[PDB]
């Protein structure tokens, strides 16, 4: 199912964003963000992302980091670009 592929990609993207925000306390992040842009444009609100909460805690059981982390995919990718430039 292609929608299950989309939701698994977004879940993995959110988990990996949490782990990258954890890893960087401040070059591989820049190459990771572009790695999640060729994917996104190959595929091509705030409430849209809350439905992913439970499936993200399945693999990353951290309420604090998920709360700190917070069309909608372009907003998150712009946030990732802004974090990579800094």
């Amino acid at each position, epitope marked *: 199912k292609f929608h299950n592929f989309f*939701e698994m990609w977004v879940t993995y993207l959110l988990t990996e964003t949490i782990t990258w925000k954890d890893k960087l306390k401040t070059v591989c992040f820049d190459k990771w963000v572009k790695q999640k842009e060729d994917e996104w444009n190959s595929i091509k609100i705030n409430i849209y992302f*809350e439905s992913f909460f439970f499936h993200v805690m399945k693999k990353l059981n*951290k309420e604090a980091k998920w709360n700190k982390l917070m069309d909608a995919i372009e907003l998150l990718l712009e946030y990732l670009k802004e974090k990579s430039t800094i």
Partner: antibody
Amino acid sequence: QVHLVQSGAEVKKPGSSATVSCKASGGPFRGYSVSWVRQAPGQGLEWMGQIITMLDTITYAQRFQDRVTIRADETTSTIYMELNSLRSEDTAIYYCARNGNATVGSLGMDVWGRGTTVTVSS
Amino acid sequence: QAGLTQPPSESKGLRETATFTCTGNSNNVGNQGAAWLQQHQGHPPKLLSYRNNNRPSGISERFSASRSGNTASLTITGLQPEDEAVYFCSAWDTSLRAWLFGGGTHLTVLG
């Protein structure tokens, strides 16, 4: 505002199979993570299993690994139950409840069902 | 033991604060937290505290929860004589992948 309404109680016999179904509404069906809780009369709750309705991921309890099965039906937005081996002391009121509030970002059994009190007897 | 151990019952008077305890291990309660549940006689258990100890909608500010590290606590200040309910602590075990419920203290007001 997610609402959970619980099916009526059913009287079973030992060795039969029970089916507890509660439908959930109030948002997208993708973002539902309801769990099934057993409370025998006279003592406390006992978590049986849960389903996260996004990628069809069910986690069972250790003692209900080979007994209970949980599935979801996205057309009617219902969550099903099944107990293959019903035994005499498996008498309880069965609840379904999501395990968190996604708007707040926290895990907790927030909204609960009415309760399907399956009573096995002879 | 690896579950959630809770005292069987606690009894406090009216207009008094009630102190709770629910101790697990580094996986059940110490890891992220524990949720507190209010169950009356023959009623579905209403939640009072999330794992981060937030107040859900429909619950007043009279309740309050916290965690002293590897032990969850829930405080009820000024017991109301119609607060006869059994209170449960739940906590997602990360080693067994299970919500673990405690025994559940029974609250009896004195009046």
